[PDB]
């Protein structure tokens, strides 16, 4: 399944993921493509930060959804 990720510089990358892929696997793909260590990735979808141990389905992420990569905020995790 394709999903999009808006990266830190404003470009958009496309990932091929399983329909219920884990968030950890998604971060692993982003690391390979963009170079960001998974521990430094913070992904937002539908106003929520995506969590390890969940899958894309937990968030109703589907074909051609767009996720946003962001920095860690002070006071955030």
């Amino acid at each position: 399944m394709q999903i999009f990720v808006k990266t830190l510089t404003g470009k958009t990358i496309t990932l091929e993921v399983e329909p219920s892929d884990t968030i950890e696997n998604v971060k692993a793909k982003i690391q390979d493509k963009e170079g960001i260590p998974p521990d430094q990735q913070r992904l937002i979808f539908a106003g929520k930060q995506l969590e390890d141990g969940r899958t894309l389905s937990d968030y109703n992420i589907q074909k051609e959804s767009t996720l946003h990569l962001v920095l860690r905020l002070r006071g955030g995790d």
């Binding site: 930060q49 962001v70 002070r74």
Partner: protein, 32 residues
Amino acid sequence: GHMGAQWNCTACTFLNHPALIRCEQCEMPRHF
């Protein structure tokens, strides 16, 4: 910046994460 509250876009109402500075739905800036 700092973690703070989710924010409702004044254009479309969507409740956005504070790490985003433009609305996830309509791209309007939070601050104007």
